[PDB]
Amino acid sequence: EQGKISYTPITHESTNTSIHITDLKDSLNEVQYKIWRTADGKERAKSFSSKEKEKQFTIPFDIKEFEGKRGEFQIEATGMKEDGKTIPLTKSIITFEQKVPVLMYHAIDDYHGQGIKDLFVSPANFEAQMKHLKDNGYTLLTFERWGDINKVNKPIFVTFDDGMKNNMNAFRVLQKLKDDTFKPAATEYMIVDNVDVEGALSTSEIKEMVDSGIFSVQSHTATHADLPKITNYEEELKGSKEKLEKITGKPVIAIAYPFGHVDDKVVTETKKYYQFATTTKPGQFITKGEPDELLKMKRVRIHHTTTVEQFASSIK
């Protein structure tokens, strides 16, 4: 191989770059760049040609060429020599960060006054919302697959706060929609000291959820503590993690801050035991390389009266 692909640096806001190639030994009348998204696969590659040696075979690359789809792009360069032969040159990777909606659900039930109205999404609505994700080719992830957000199409994280029994309704809907094409996954943030108490998930229910492969069960602290206000951080953060890990049989790496209450101190303590933390601040996540950004993740709130159309717009 003879290589060194170079491109102009990008940020999370970039939509274009300039790609050229240097350190060539052979003389070429043409170089082809084959470019494809890892999520789509080699079969959906698009090709670009440059016959300009003096400009180091520069090409403009813009994601409008892929209908504004972002993520990881693989670049494969080949050249045609002066003797008619086509040779391999080199390969490279460029990654346009994609946005990641993190959905916040709480209770999945019809409302009978059994809590905060806005926190209840009906089974019919929930099914409609999940079917919209299925039909439009969203890839439902959990935090164990964080490394894949730029390698899949339309990544999204469905999350549930508290560990309510009615989240078994969500489990049944997700099971029912599963098939060869659609592999649902979701994250449940459990109040760990509520395991096996009335109205909360039992140990056997949690185990069924995890064993199915659909749910990743993660921390919501031990007692749903107001984190900025307490000092028993080891107990609420590390203790909830460890207790929950023996229930699930799988690592606990994520937390949701109760009440959405967080400050610099809470982040400092959380970082000792968790890799990912979600707030209740509205918005979609994108990787910017800001300090501790994985521990201050925004979420998209779904409301009692949210229609599929409102839902769809909130995640685009």
Minimum gap (Å) between residue 221 Cβ and Zn ion: 9
CB distance 215 to 185 below 8 Å: yes
Size, binding site for Zn ion by CB under 5 A: 2
Q: Which residue matches tokens 């599963």?
A: 178
CB distance 7 to 120 below 8 Å: no
Does the annotation flag 118 for ligand binding? Answer: no
Scan residues 104-163 and list those touching Zn ion (CB under 5 A): 161-162
Report d(CA 23, CA 14) in Å as an integer: 27
In the bound state with Zn ion, the residue whose beta carbon lies nearer, of 92 and 221, is: 221
Reading the block at residue 155, the tokens are 């990544």
Minimum gap (Å) between residue 122 Cβ and Zn ion: 20
In the bound state with Zn ion, the residue whose beta carbon lies nearer, of 119 and 247, is: 119
Site mask, Zn ion, residues 158-197, x = CB under 5 A? ---xx-----------------------------------
Does the annotation flag 106 for ligand binding? Answer: no
N-term to C-term CA, the chain = 41
Report d(CA 94, CA 71) in Å as an integer: 8
In the bound state with Zn ion, the residue whose beta carbon lies nearer, of 37 and 224, is: 224
Separation in Å, CA 224 to CA 110, 140, 181, 196, 259: 24, 26, 37, 16, 8
Does the annotation flag 162 for ligand binding? Answer: yes
Scan residues 58-87 and list those touching Zn ion (CB under 5 A): none
Minimum gap (Å) between residue 161 Cβ and Zn ion: 4
Which residues would be at the binding site for Zn ion (CB under 5 A)? 161-162
**Binding-site positions for Zn(2+):** 162, 220, 224
